[PDB]
Amino acid sequence: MLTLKIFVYTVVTFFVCLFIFGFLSNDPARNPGK
């Protein structure tokens, strides 16, 4: 079950880190703008 548990934490933390470092990566300027 530990082989599963490492994999679940890996996928979860990969997607959460992708989320956080996406929103730090210049979000409110990728609009149609003015």
Q: Tell whether residue 10 is a contact of other proteins (CB under 8 A).
A: yes
d(CA 4, CA 10): 10
Count of residues that interact with other proteins, criterion CB under 8 A = 16
SS3 (DSSP) at 26? coil
Q: How far is the CB of 22 from other proteins (least distance, A)?
A: 9
Q: Tell whether residue 4 is a contact of other proteins (CB under 8 A).
A: no
d(CA 19, CA 9): 15
For other proteins, the binding residues (CB under 8 A) are 1-2, 5-6, 9-10, 13-14, 17-18, 21, 24-26, 28-29
